[PDB]
Amino acid sequence: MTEYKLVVVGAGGVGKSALTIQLIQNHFVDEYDPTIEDSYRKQVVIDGETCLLDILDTAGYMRTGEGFLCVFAINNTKSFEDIHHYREQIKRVKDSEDVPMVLVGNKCDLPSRTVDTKQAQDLARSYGIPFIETSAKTRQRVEDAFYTLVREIRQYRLK
Ligand SMILES: Nc1nc2c(ncn2[C@@H]2O[C@H](COP(=O)(O)OP(=O)(O)NP(=O)(O)O)[C@@H](O)[C@H]2O)c(=O)[nH]1
Ligand SMILES: [Mg+2]
Ligand SMILES: [Mg+2]
């Protein structure tokens, strides 16, 4: 079983825990319980590779993580602004510009959007990483988000 150490980062309340619990448990957490630091391990098959995912759900690990899910909420402009701070801190710690990352715009089921998809696409394009729009509430593209991050790490290891 190939291991992938994934770390979910982003401002408070953007749905990091909700996305992680949807992946692990197939259950939407409606209550907002602020996270300290939670670890999960899940065995999955991704593109035919049997994988062990080690997911660290952080509070709103930069050394141990191999790939980072950088989450903002599409109805929280400040959380989108704060992404740069998360990425720059990761880059500093890993002393690298190619660390595997996926940009996640969560809560896409909410109509009170203030981060336009074009803004998010331009940021992702700049960093050289994928962009996935999710909803933990409806479980839209939750697996896609985490599996895309796995694939980024896989491609990184193979150059
Ligand atoms: N409508 C909607 N609400 C969501 C979605 N994802 C999370 N939420 C809601 O937003 C709140 C915060 O979700 P939660 O996962 O704790 O946030 P978090 O980033 O883990 N926060 P923290 O940093 O404090 O640990 C919860 O009420 C949750 O139900 C989503 O896709 N859609
Ligand atoms: Mg949390
Ligand atoms: Mg605007």
Q: Indicate which technique resolved this structure.
A: X-ray
Cβ neighbors of 14 (< 8 A, separation 6 or more) are 60, 71, 72, 73, 76, 79, 106, 107
Q: Is 75 in the pocket of ligand 1 (CB under 6 A)?
A: no
- Per the structure block, which two tokens stand in for 82? 């704060």
Q: Which domain holds residue 41?
A: 2-157
CB of 18 within 6 A of ligand 1: the answer is yes
Which domain CATH number covers 54? 3.40.50.300
Please tell me the residue having the least CA distance from ligand 1 atom 2.
107
Helix axes 142-157, 16-25, angle to 10 degrees: 90
What strand order describes the sheet that includes 2-10?
Answer: 37-46, 49-58, 2-10, 67-73, 101-106, 131-133
Count structural domains, the chain.
1
Q: In this structure, which amino acid lies at residue 49?
A: E
Pick from 71, 75, 60, 83: nearest CA to 22: 71
9: closest CA among 68, 52, 63?
Answer: 68
Strands 2-10 and 67-73: parallel
Is the CB of residue 14 below 6 angstroms from any atom belonging to ligand 1? yes
Q: What is the per-residue burial (b if ≥16 Cβ within 10 Å, else e) of 71-88?
A: bbbbbbeebbebbeebbe
Instruction: Sort strands 37-46 and 49-58 into parallel, antiparallel or unpaired.
Output: antiparallel
d(CA 52, CA 44) in angstroms, rounded, equals 6
Question: For residues 148, 83, 10 and 58, what is the CA-based torsion angle, rounded to 10 degrees?
Answer: 90
**Contact present, 123 and 38 (Cβ < 8 Å):** no
Q: What is the largest CA-CA distance in the chain?
A: 42
Q: What Å distances lie between residue 20 and 118, 133, 153, 155, 156, CA to CA?
A: 25, 15, 18, 23, 23
